[PDB]
Amino acid sequence: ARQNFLGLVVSQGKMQKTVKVRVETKVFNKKINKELFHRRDYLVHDEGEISREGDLVRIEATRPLSKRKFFAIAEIIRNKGQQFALYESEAQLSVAKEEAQKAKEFLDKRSVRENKTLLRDIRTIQDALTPKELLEIKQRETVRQLLQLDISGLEVNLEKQRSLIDRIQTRLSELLSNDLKCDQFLKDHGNIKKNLLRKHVMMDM
Amino acid sequence: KHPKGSHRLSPKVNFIDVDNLIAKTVAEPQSIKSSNGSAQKVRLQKAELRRKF
RNA sequence: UUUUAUAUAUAUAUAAUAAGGAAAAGUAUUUAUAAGAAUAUGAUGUUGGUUCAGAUUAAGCGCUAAAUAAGGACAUGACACAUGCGAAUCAUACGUUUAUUAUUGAGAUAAUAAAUAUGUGGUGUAAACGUGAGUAAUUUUAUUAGGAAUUAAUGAACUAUAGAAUAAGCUAAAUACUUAAUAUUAUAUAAAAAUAAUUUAUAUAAUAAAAAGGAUAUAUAUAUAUAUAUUUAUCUAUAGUCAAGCCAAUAAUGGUUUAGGUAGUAGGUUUAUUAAGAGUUAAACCUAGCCAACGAUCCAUAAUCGAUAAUGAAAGUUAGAACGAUCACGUUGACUCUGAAAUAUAGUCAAUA
RNA sequence: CAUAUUAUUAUCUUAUUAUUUAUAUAAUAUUUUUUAAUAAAUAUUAUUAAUUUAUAUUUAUUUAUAUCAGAAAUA
Ligand SMILES: [Mg+2]
Ligand SMILES: [Mg+2]
Ligand SMILES: [Mg+2]
Ligand SMILES: [Mg+2]
Ligand SMILES: [Mg+2]
Ligand SMILES: [Mg+2]
Ligand SMILES: [Mg+2]
Ligand SMILES: [Mg+2]
Ligand SMILES: [Mg+2]
Ligand SMILES: [Mg+2]
Ligand SMILES: [Mg+2]
Ligand SMILES: [Mg+2]
Ligand SMILES: [Mg+2]
Ligand SMILES: [Mg+2]
Ligand SMILES: [Mg+2]
Ligand SMILES: [Mg+2]
Ligand SMILES: [Mg+2]
Ligand SMILES: [Mg+2]
Ligand SMILES: [Mg+2]
Ligand SMILES: [Mg+2]
Ligand SMILES: [Mg+2]
Ligand SMILES: [Mg+2]
Ligand SMILES: [Mg+2]
Ligand SMILES: [Mg+2]
């Protein structure tokens, strides 16, 4: 049959309808006493110019098409070279819009800080517990709400996570202890049983 | 696609038919009837032996 | 261990408790094969080179030499050559020349014998033989169960089959030459698939391209023709056999103190040319490529190889004389005819003698 | 400094050859218009040799491209 060599495209777009394909073959060298790879580069016909650098292809025997070109591409097993340009263009397009959004956010934050006395205000509300400035500050347990800190949110979130983990583990252990109770749990929900119990128990919680 | 001037597939194998090869290569004479010839008998004998072989 | 008890807040601490004992007699080929020595040192060990012990030659030379049988024999100046041979053969291609017999009257024609290859022709010298200059690959060598452009209406020269072998001219005459007659591919329609093409069948178009008679006998008639038969020839067609043309992959010496090289250069599109692909050559228009420190380009050297020779335990290393395969050359260089194939040991031109 | 041989070339010369140009009262074949010499019959009418004419196959001539080999230059 026509000679067939598996290869990787190493140069493309330099010439018209011609690429360089990197063919590796197994040879035995006696002086080393080793099977080693021997490498060559073939000038190959690419009609349609589909193949891109980095793609994994055949190059198959053909009539002489030029002085140095005797092989033609037949198919592309791996389209990595093709994808490397599509992803490039998509990355450019997406980065532009994401840049624009984040720059808008930064400009907005600059405006907020430009607009820009909390201690004095809070003390004025505290002493009140006068009327007009108090109302204006209101527009600008209320003291507790105005001073609620993000750390409390972190504390409650941490407690939620720990409670969830511990409850899951204790229910798993409890159901695993009584094997029949595990089967009842499975049937009500409607080593394989172990995974099914784990899934159902976490879905419960 | 393949190159413009090339053939996508290799030439198809020409499967010999032994009966056809025998018929075309060595064909029995149509004119069986012939008269006496000194060299004609020898030529006929040689041709028959070669065809058989 | 395991299980359980009490106590304490599903878990924890203490206490007790433990299921693993079975038996039986008899039922070679081993493979391939690697040896060192002398010389350092005041002496020792080690590194280290040098030399030696073995085998062999395309051998030469010194001394010596009986016969027979076989295998080799200009490796150097691809330096120059006196002399003789190495490619002729056909009288059944055509012509000539004689002698006798016969009839015809210096000749004419037959029959029988001969000569004639200093005239016109056919076939053979692209082989074989010898050589190794060139060639480091741009076409060379080796190998592949490698290919296509998917190689010609190619037979070179035999086999098997069918056909045909006609007319003129010029030769003094012809199987010599010319002129003429006659006898796969490209399209269109379908079919399939080994399909993004190929193949198959059909119908057309042109295929459309030839030839040659001699030697004998007889049979006719009127020496002339003719008609057969036997022999040897000629042309065409199909198939076979033997063959050719082109490309791919891997390998093929030394020097980078030769590091950059290449502009037809690398690729693309067409056209001319071939049976056939391709910057192989010729023309045109585009792109900027291609090779290279895993060594390009350049230079030097060299015919290449084997189931050949030598050597080694072997991997390998050396040779390429002898046997065999391939290439190139026939004093040097280029081109041309013929041809299927030649830059032919041909021809032409030039160079050398 | 001197000798030598391969290689090349924006240079010079060029055998032969391959294409390619332009020309031929240039030929040869055939096709016409015509002229001589000749042949059969009652003014001929055709024939061969020469005149003019336009298609092929070449010859001489020159246009260009390449080209063995030679100088010149370089290595
Ligand atoms: Mg091409
Ligand atoms: Mg000593
Ligand atoms: Mg020795
Ligand atoms: Mg002898
Ligand atoms: Mg010699
Ligand atoms: Mg020799
Ligand atoms: Mg004779
Ligand atoms: Mg003669
Ligand atoms: Mg020869
Ligand atoms: Mg020989
Ligand atoms: Mg004649
Ligand atoms: Mg003839
Ligand atoms: Mg081309
Ligand atoms: Mg080239
Ligand atoms: Mg060009
Ligand atoms: Mg080098
Ligand atoms: Mg040599
Ligand atoms: Mg040589
Ligand atoms: Mg030899
Ligand atoms: Mg050698
Ligand atoms: Mg010899
Ligand atoms: Mg020669
Ligand atoms: Mg020569
Ligand atoms: Mg000589």
Short mmCIF file of N, CA and C (backbone and C1' of nucleotides) in Angstrom, two decimals, chain C residues 303-351:
data_model
loop_
_atom_site.label_atom_id
_atom_site.label_comp_id
_atom_site.label_asym_id
_atom_site.label_seq_id
_atom_site.Cartn_x
_atom_site.Cartn_y
_atom_site.Cartn_z
P A C 303 38.96 3.81 -6.92
"O5'" A C 303 37.59 3.48 -7.66
"C5'" A C 303 36.74 2.47 -7.16
"C4'" A C 303 35.29 2.89 -7.19
"C3'" A C 303 34.36 2.08 -6.31
"O3'" A C 303 34.36 2.52 -4.96
"C1'" A C 303 33.43 2.28 -8.47
P U C 304 34.21 1.46 -3.76
"O5'" U C 304 32.69 1.00 -3.85
"C5'" U C 304 31.64 1.92 -3.57
"C4'" U C 304 30.30 1.24 -3.58
"C3'" U C 304 30.23 -0.10 -2.86
"O3'" U C 304 30.11 0.01 -1.46
"C1'" U C 304 29.21 -0.30 -4.97
P C C 305 30.72 -1.15 -0.51
"O5'" C C 305 29.79 -2.41 -0.81
"C5'" C C 305 28.41 -2.39 -0.46
"C4'" C C 305 27.65 -3.53 -1.09
"C3'" C C 305 28.00 -4.93 -0.62
"O3'" C C 305 27.42 -5.25 0.64
"C1'" C C 305 27.81 -4.92 -2.97
P G C 306 28.02 -6.46 1.51
"O5'" G C 306 27.56 -7.77 0.72
"C5'" G C 306 26.19 -8.14 0.65
"C4'" G C 306 26.01 -9.44 -0.08
"C3'" G C 306 26.79 -10.63 0.47
"O3'" G C 306 26.15 -11.22 1.58
"C1'" G C 306 27.02 -10.54 -1.89
P A C 307 26.99 -11.83 2.80
"O5'" A C 307 27.01 -13.40 2.51
"C5'" A C 307 25.80 -14.10 2.23
"C4'" A C 307 26.08 -15.49 1.71
"C3'" A C 307 26.77 -15.55 0.35
"O3'" A C 307 27.66 -16.66 0.30
"C1'" A C 307 24.71 -16.68 0.24
P U C 308 29.18 -16.50 0.80
"O5'" U C 308 29.89 -15.70 -0.37
"C5'" U C 308 30.22 -16.33 -1.60
"C4'" U C 308 31.53 -15.82 -2.14
"C3'" U C 308 32.70 -15.82 -1.17
"O3'" U C 308 33.31 -17.09 -1.04
"C1'" U C 308 32.59 -13.73 -2.24
P A C 309 34.00 -17.52 0.35
"O5'" A C 309 35.31 -16.62 0.43
"C5'" A C 309 36.39 -16.81 -0.47
"C4'" A C 309 37.54 -15.89 -0.18
"C3'" A C 309 38.01 -15.85 1.26
"O3'" A C 309 38.84 -16.94 1.61
"C1'" A C 309 37.81 -13.64 0.44
P A C 310 38.87 -17.48 3.12
"O5'" A C 310 39.61 -16.33 3.92
"C5'" A C 310 40.93 -15.95 3.58
"C4'" A C 310 41.41 -14.80 4.42
"C3'" A C 310 41.20 -14.93 5.92
"O3'" A C 310 42.17 -15.76 6.54
"C1'" A C 310 40.56 -12.76 5.21
P U C 311 41.76 -16.70 7.76
"O5'" U C 311 41.57 -15.69 8.97
"C5'" U C 311 42.60 -14.78 9.32
"C4'" U C 311 42.10 -13.71 10.25
"C3'" U C 311 41.32 -14.20 11.46
"O3'" U C 311 42.16 -14.67 12.50
"C1'" U C 311 40.14 -12.43 10.45
P G C 312 41.71 -15.91 13.41
"O5'" G C 312 40.67 -15.27 14.43
"C5'" G C 312 41.07 -14.22 15.29
"C4'" G C 312 39.89 -13.53 15.92
"C3'" G C 312 38.86 -14.43 16.59
"O3'" G C 312 39.27 -14.89 17.86
"C1'" G C 312 37.76 -12.79 15.29
P A C 313 39.15 -16.44 18.25
"O5'" A C 313 37.62 -16.61 18.65
"C5'" A C 313 36.85 -17.70 18.18
"C4'" A C 313 35.46 -17.68 18.76
"C3'" A C 313 34.50 -16.68 18.14
"O3'" A C 313 33.86 -17.21 16.99
"C1'" A C 313 34.44 -16.47 20.50
P A C 314 33.74 -16.34 15.64
"O5'" A C 314 32.59 -15.29 15.95
"C5'" A C 314 31.27 -15.72 16.26
"C4'" A C 314 30.53 -14.66 17.04
"C3'" A C 314 30.42 -13.30 16.37
"O3'" A C 314 29.33 -13.23 15.47
"C1'" A C 314 31.19 -13.02 18.59
P A C 315 29.31 -12.11 14.31
"O5'" A C 315 29.07 -10.75 15.09
"C5'" A C 315 27.82 -10.47 15.72
"C4'" A C 315 27.85 -9.14 16.43
"C3'" A C 315 28.24 -7.95 15.57
"O3'" A C 315 27.15 -7.45 14.81
"C1'" A C 315 29.46 -7.89 17.60
P G C 316 27.38 -6.93 13.31
"O5'" G C 316 28.05 -5.50 13.51
"C5'" G C 316 29.16 -5.09 12.72
"C4'" G C 316 30.41 -4.98 13.55
"C3'" G C 316 31.67 -4.55 12.81
"O3'" G C 316 31.73 -3.14 12.62
"C1'" G C 316 32.16 -6.41 14.19
P U C 317 32.02 -2.53 11.16
"O5'" U C 317 33.59 -2.75 10.97
"C5'" U C 317 34.51 -2.21 11.90
"C4'" U C 317 35.90 -2.76 11.68
"C3'" U C 317 36.39 -2.76 10.24
"O3'" U C 317 36.89 -1.50 9.82
"C1'" U C 317 36.79 -4.87 11.20
P U C 318 36.66 -1.01 8.31
"O5'" U C 318 37.65 -1.92 7.46
"C5'" U C 318 39.05 -1.84 7.66
"C4'" U C 318 39.80 -2.87 6.86
"C3'" U C 318 39.48 -2.92 5.37
"O3'" U C 318 40.13 -1.91 4.62
"C1'" U C 318 39.51 -5.11 6.25
P A C 319 39.48 -1.39 3.25
"O5'" A C 319 39.60 -2.63 2.26
"C5'" A C 319 40.88 -3.12 1.85
"C4'" A C 319 40.77 -4.36 1.01
"C3'" A C 319 39.95 -4.24 -0.26
"O3'" A C 319 40.68 -3.65 -1.32
"C1'" A C 319 39.41 -6.26 0.87
P G C 320 39.95 -2.69 -2.39
"O5'" G C 320 38.94 -3.66 -3.15
"C5'" G C 320 39.41 -4.82 -3.83
"C4'" G C 320 38.27 -5.69 -4.29
"C3'" G C 320 37.40 -5.08 -5.37
"O3'" G C 320 36.91 -6.11 -6.23
"C1'" G C 320 36.09 -5.46 -3.44
P A C 321 37.56 -6.33 -7.68
"O5'" A C 321 38.95 -7.06 -7.38
"C5'" A C 321 40.12 -6.71 -8.11
"C4'" A C 321 41.06 -7.88 -8.28
"C3'" A C 321 40.42 -9.20 -8.71
"O3'" A C 321 40.16 -9.26 -10.10
"C1'" A C 321 41.95 -9.59 -6.95
P A C 322 38.77 -9.86 -10.65
"O5'" A C 322 38.84 -11.40 -10.25
"C5'" A C 322 39.79 -12.28 -10.85
"C4'" A C 322 39.78 -13.63 -10.18
"C3'" A C 322 38.43 -14.32 -10.10
"O3'" A C 322 38.11 -15.04 -11.28
"C1'" A C 322 39.45 -14.33 -7.97
P C C 323 36.83 -14.64 -12.16
"O5'" C C 323 35.61 -15.28 -11.36
"C5'" C C 323 35.45 -16.69 -11.28
"C4'" C C 323 34.20 -17.06 -10.52
"C3'" C C 323 32.98 -16.18 -10.78
"O3'" C C 323 32.29 -16.53 -11.96
"C1'" C C 323 33.27 -16.47 -8.45
P G C 324 31.71 -15.38 -12.93
"O5'" G C 324 30.46 -14.81 -12.14
"C5'" G C 324 29.36 -15.65 -11.84
"C4'" G C 324 28.45 -15.05 -10.79
"C3'" G C 324 27.90 -13.67 -11.10
"O3'" G C 324 26.82 -13.69 -12.02
"C1'" G C 324 28.64 -13.74 -8.86
P A C 325 26.54 -12.42 -12.96
"O5'" A C 325 25.87 -11.35 -11.98
"C5'" A C 325 24.56 -11.57 -11.47
"C4'" A C 325 24.09 -10.41 -10.63
"C3'" A C 325 24.21 -9.03 -11.26
"O3'" A C 325 23.16 -8.75 -12.17
"C1'" A C 325 25.04 -8.95 -9.06
P U C 326 23.42 -7.74 -13.40
"O5'" U C 326 23.56 -6.32 -12.70
"C5'" U C 326 22.48 -5.76 -11.98
"C4'" U C 326 22.84 -4.42 -11.37
"C3'" U C 326 23.48 -3.42 -12.31
"O3'" U C 326 22.56 -2.76 -13.16
"C1'" U C 326 24.68 -3.47 -10.28
P C C 327 23.04 -2.19 -14.58
"O5'" C C 327 23.97 -0.95 -14.20
"C5'" C C 327 23.43 0.16 -13.51
"C4'" C C 327 24.51 1.10 -13.02
"C3'" C C 327 25.37 1.74 -14.09
"O3'" C C 327 24.74 2.86 -14.69
"C1'" C C 327 26.74 0.94 -12.33
P A C 328 24.83 3.09 -16.28
"O5'" A C 328 26.27 3.73 -16.49
"C5'" A C 328 26.62 4.95 -15.84
"C4'" A C 328 28.12 5.13 -15.79
"C3'" A C 328 28.83 5.02 -17.13
"O3'" A C 328 28.77 6.21 -17.88
"C1'" A C 328 29.98 3.74 -15.50
P C C 329 28.64 6.16 -19.48
"O5'" C C 329 30.12 5.85 -19.98
"C5'" C C 329 31.17 6.75 -19.70
"C4'" C C 329 32.52 6.09 -19.81
"C3'" C C 329 32.86 5.46 -21.15
"O3'" C C 329 33.27 6.41 -22.12
"C1'" C C 329 33.43 3.96 -19.42
P G C 330 33.04 6.11 -23.69
"O5'" G C 330 34.20 5.08 -24.06
"C5'" G C 330 35.56 5.48 -23.98
"C4'" G C 330 36.50 4.36 -24.38
"C3'" G C 330 36.47 4.00 -25.86
"O3'" G C 330 37.78 3.61 -26.29
"C1'" G C 330 35.82 2.12 -24.59
P U C 331 38.61 4.54 -27.31
"O5'" U C 331 39.11 5.75 -26.41
"C5'" U C 331 40.03 5.54 -25.34
"C4'" U C 331 40.77 6.81 -24.99
"C3'" U C 331 39.91 8.02 -24.69
"O3'" U C 331 39.40 8.03 -23.36
"C1'" U C 331 41.59 8.64 -26.21
P U C 332 37.94 8.63 -23.07
"O5'" U C 332 38.12 10.20 -23.24
"C5'" U C 332 38.76 10.98 -22.24
"C4'" U C 332 38.56 12.45 -22.47
"C3'" U C 332 37.13 12.92 -22.66
"O3'" U C 332 36.43 13.06 -21.44
"C1'" U C 332 38.49 13.89 -24.32
P G C 333 34.83 12.94 -21.40
"O5'" G C 333 34.32 14.26 -22.12
"C5'" G C 333 34.45 15.53 -21.50
"C4'" G C 333 33.88 16.64 -22.35
"C3'" G C 333 32.47 16.43 -22.87
"O3'" G C 333 31.46 16.70 -21.91
"C1'" G C 333 33.85 17.23 -24.62
P A C 334 29.99 16.06 -22.09
"O5'" A C 334 29.37 16.85 -23.32
"C5'" A C 334 28.89 18.18 -23.16
"C4'" A C 334 28.57 18.82 -24.49
"C3'" A C 334 27.36 18.28 -25.24
"O3'" A C 334 26.13 18.75 -24.73
"C1'" A C 334 29.16 18.55 -26.74
P C C 335 24.82 17.81 -24.77
"O5'" C C 335 24.44 17.75 -26.31
"C5'" C C 335 23.78 18.84 -26.95
"C4'" C C 335 23.91 18.78 -28.45
"C3'" C C 335 23.04 17.75 -29.16
"O3'" C C 335 21.70 18.18 -29.35
"C1'" C C 335 25.25 17.64 -29.99
P U C 336 20.51 17.10 -29.46
"O5'" U C 336 20.70 16.45 -30.90
"C5'" U C 336 20.62 17.25 -32.07
"C4'" U C 336 20.82 16.45 -33.33
"C3'" U C 336 20.02 15.16 -33.44
"O3'" U C 336 18.69 15.37 -33.88
"C1'" U C 336 22.27 14.73 -33.99
P C C 337 17.59 14.21 -33.70
"O5'" C C 337 18.00 13.10 -34.77
"C5'" C C 337 17.80 13.31 -36.16
"C4'" C C 337 18.26 12.13 -36.98
"C3'" C C 337 17.53 10.82 -36.74
"O3'" C C 337 16.30 10.75 -37.43
"C1'" C C 337 19.88 10.45 -36.85
P U C 338 15.02 10.06 -36.75
"O5'" U C 338 15.39 8.51 -36.70
"C5'" U C 338 15.57 7.77 -37.90
"C4'" U C 338 16.24 6.45 -37.63
"C3'" U C 338 15.59 5.58 -36.57
"O3'" U C 338 14.50 4.83 -37.08
"C1'" U C 338 17.92 5.68 -36.18
P G C 339 13.01 5.05 -36.52
"O5'" G C 339 12.96 4.17 -35.19
"C5'" G C 339 13.20 2.77 -35.24
"C4'" G C 339 13.99 2.30 -34.05
"C3'" G C 339 13.30 2.42 -32.70
"O3'" G C 339 12.40 1.35 -32.44
"C1'" G C 339 15.48 3.30 -32.54
P A C 340 10.83 1.51 -32.73
"O5'" A C 340 10.18 1.69 -31.29
"C5'" A C 340 10.32 2.90 -30.56
"C4'" A C 340 10.38 2.64 -29.08
"C3'" A C 340 11.66 3.07 -28.38
"O3'" A C 340 11.63 4.44 -28.01
"C1'" A C 340 11.09 0.86 -27.73
P A C 341 12.89 5.39 -28.30
"O5'" A C 341 13.97 4.95 -27.22
"C5'" A C 341 13.70 5.06 -25.83
"C4'" A C 341 14.59 4.15 -25.02
"C3'" A C 341 16.09 4.31 -25.26
"O3'" A C 341 16.64 5.37 -24.50
"C1'" A C 341 15.51 2.01 -25.35
P A C 342 17.39 6.59 -25.24
"O5'" A C 342 18.78 5.97 -25.69
"C5'" A C 342 19.58 5.23 -24.77
"C4'" A C 342 21.05 5.33 -25.09
"C3'" A C 342 21.56 6.76 -25.32
"O3'" A C 342 22.91 6.86 -24.86
"C1'" A C 342 21.94 5.47 -27.25
P U C 343 23.23 7.03 -23.29
"O5'" U C 343 24.21 8.28 -23.23
"C5'" U C 343 23.76 9.58 -23.59
"C4'" U C 343 24.08 9.92 -25.02
"C3'" U C 343 25.51 10.37 -25.28
"O3'" U C 343 25.93 9.93 -26.57
"C1'" U C 343 24.02 12.09 -25.89
P A C 344 27.23 8.99 -26.75
"O5'" A C 344 26.62 7.58 -27.18
"C5'" A C 344 26.05 6.69 -26.22
"C4'" A C 344 26.20 5.25 -26.63
"C3'" A C 344 27.55 4.88 -27.23
"O3'" A C 344 27.89 3.54 -26.90
"C1'" A C 344 25.85 4.51 -28.84
P U C 345 29.36 3.19 -26.36
"O5'" U C 345 30.28 3.33 -27.66
"C5'" U C 345 31.36 4.25 -27.70
"C4'" U C 345 32.36 3.89 -28.76
"C3'" U C 345 31.76 3.39 -30.08
"O3'" U C 345 32.57 3.82 -31.18
"C1'" U C 345 33.14 1.71 -29.16
P A C 346 32.12 5.07 -32.08
"O5'" A C 346 30.77 4.58 -32.77
"C5'" A C 346 30.78 3.65 -33.84
"C4'" A C 346 29.61 3.88 -34.78
"C3'" A C 346 29.61 5.22 -35.51
"O3'" A C 346 30.40 5.19 -36.69
"C1'" A C 346 27.50 4.87 -34.51
P G C 347 31.43 6.39 -37.01
"O5'" G C 347 30.49 7.58 -37.48
"C5'" G C 347 29.63 7.45 -38.60
"C4'" G C 347 28.69 8.63 -38.72
"C3'" G C 347 29.35 10.00 -38.63
"O3'" G C 347 29.87 10.43 -39.87
"C1'" G C 347 27.48 9.92 -37.18
P U C 348 31.16 11.38 -39.92
"O5'" U C 348 30.63 12.76 -39.34
"C5'" U C 348 29.61 13.49 -40.00
"C4'" U C 348 29.28 14.77 -39.28
"C3'" U C 348 30.48 15.58 -38.81
"O3'" U C 348 31.06 16.36 -39.84
"C1'" U C 348 28.91 15.41 -37.05
P C C 349 32.63 16.70 -39.80
"O5'" C C 349 32.76 17.71 -38.57
"C5'" C C 349 32.03 18.93 -38.57
"C4'" C C 349 32.08 19.61 -37.22
"C3'" C C 349 33.45 19.73 -36.59
"O3'" C C 349 34.25 20.75 -37.17
"C1'" C C 349 31.89 19.05 -34.96
P A C 350 35.80 20.47 -37.47
"O5'" A C 350 36.49 20.62 -36.05
"C5'" A C 350 36.62 21.90 -35.45
"C4'" A C 350 36.62 21.84 -33.94
"C3'" A C 350 37.87 21.30 -33.29
"O3'" A C 350 38.94 22.23 -33.26
"C1'" A C 350 35.98 20.35 -32.25
P A C 351 40.46 21.72 -33.33
"O5'" A C 351 40.70 21.04 -31.91
"C5'" A C 351 40.62 21.81 -30.72
"C4'" A C 351 41.00 20.99 -29.51
"C3'" A C 351 42.24 20.12 -29.65
"O3'" A C 351 43.44 20.85 -29.48
"C1'" A C 351 40.49 18.86 -28.67
#
